[PDB]
Amino acid sequence: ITRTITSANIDRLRFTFGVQALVETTSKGDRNPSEVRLLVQIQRNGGWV
Amino acid sequence: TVRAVNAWGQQGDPASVSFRIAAPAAPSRIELTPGYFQITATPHLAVYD
Amino acid sequence: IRSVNTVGKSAFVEAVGRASDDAEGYLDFFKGKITESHLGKELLEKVEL
Amino acid sequence: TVRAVNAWGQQGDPASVSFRIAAPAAPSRIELTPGYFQITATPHLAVYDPTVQFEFWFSEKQIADIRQVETSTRYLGTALYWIAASINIKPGHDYYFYIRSVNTVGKSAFVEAVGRASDDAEGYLDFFKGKITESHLGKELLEKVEL
């Protein structure tokens, strides 16, 4: 996505992420978890740390 | 509708959500296995309930 | 047939079914096993002659 | 863990207990009553569990592995018994029921039961005593018995 906050008087940054739905449907029923992974990265000059 | 209140009893701005409880859907298909003077019918829905 | 639960009832769905087509399979294992007493009396008196 | 507190909010020493919620056990035995082109299978557990049912799976040929049951066989249903009746089901050929215990917590490992249909003998033919008289016989049989 990237947003380029470029603010002036910021002190700390809070990210509000989430998952729309995590079900994993199978035959009939008995849904299971999905175990997603996400990554939050800073600009840090050029290296996306 | 959910409203937040503080320790002084003052309510807050309301936040609303809407959902629905509906009758079960009609069966999608019916498997009809013939037998000796008998018929075995097994229904199947689009989604398992 | 229709879906039923504690909330409500759904509209019926029609399934047209037939019994067995009277195959020889239901006779295939009567192979050599109707001999002496399962036949009608007129048939007995016509086969004894 | 349970801790006691007084009216001043001070918690006490903790007291611990440990329990376990486990998947239902596999059925101990399977009673396979043959029928007319049908088999009635009733499972029985070592201990009765009012909160359990049984999933049945059908195989016309045996599979040594018990892991591909969900892939190599057909799903039959969940109940306390199963009356498998079909035209394609015929006596004299063995059939295999892979059954397991099912509930809201989990599923148990499958258990195999090899069953046969009825022997198809005079028990199903004494019903016919003195009743194939004039019209049930094939046309060649008619023209051979009229002569």
Contact B32, C14 (CB under 8 A): no
Q: How far apart, in Å, are the Cα atoms of C19 and each of B25, B27, B32, D83, D84?
A: 28, 22, 9, 17, 16
Q: How far apart are CA A27 and CA A44, in angstroms?
A: 46
Interchain pair C37, D134: CB under 8 A:
no
Q: Is D90 exposed, middle or buried (0-12, 13-18, 19+ CB in 10 A)?
A: middle
Q: Please report the resolution in angstroms.
A: 3.0
Q: How far apart are CA B2 and CA B23, in angstroms?
A: 26
Residues facing D53 on adjacent strands: D102
Of residues B36, B40, B42, nearest to D37 (C-beta): B36
Interchain pair C18, B27: CB under 8 A:
no
Which among D5, D105, D115 is positioned nearest to D59, based on CA atoms?
D115
- Closest Cα in chain D, distance from residue C42 (Å): 7
Which among C14, C12, B30, C16 is positioned nearest to C2, based on CA atoms?
C12
Contact B42, B31 (CB under 8 A): yes
Interchain pair C46, D145: CB under 8 A:
yes
Q: How far apart are CA D5 and CA B22, in angstroms?
A: 46
Q: Is D134 exposed, middle or buried (0-12, 13-18, 19+ CB in 10 A)?
A: exposed
With touching defined as 3+ CB pairs under 8 A, do chains A and C touch? no
C12 interface with D at CB cutoff 8 Å: no
**Residue B9, token pair as written in the block:** 């009893």
Which among B26, B43, B18, C41 is positioned nearest to D77, based on CA atoms?
B43
Contact D23, D105 (CB under 8 A): yes
Optimal mutation site among C1, C6, C30, interface B, most CBs of chain B within 10 A: C1
Cβ neighbour number for residue C23 with a 10 Å cutoff: 9
Backbone angles phi, psi at C45, to 5 degrees: -70, -20
**Residue D92, token pair as written in the block:** 């004299």
Which subunits count as partners of chain B given 3+ CB pairs below 8 Å?
C, D
Query: For residue C35, which residues of chain D lie inside 8 Å, CB to CB?
Result: none
Q: How far apart, in Å, are the Cα atoms of D95 and each of B8, B34, C41, D46?
A: 73, 20, 40, 24
DSSP conformation class of D13:
-
Interchain pair D36, B40: CB under 8 A:
no
Interchain pair C38, D125: CB under 8 A:
yes
Q: How far apart are CA D9 and CA D53, in angstroms?
A: 47
Which subunits count as partners of chain C given 3+ CB pairs below 8 Å?
B, D
Q: How far apart are CA D98 and CA C48, in angstroms?
A: 52
Q: How far apart are CA D107 and CA D22, in angstroms?
A: 10
Q: How far apart, in Å, are the Cα atoms of D4 and each of C35, D10, D19, D46, D116?
A: 86, 8, 21, 40, 62
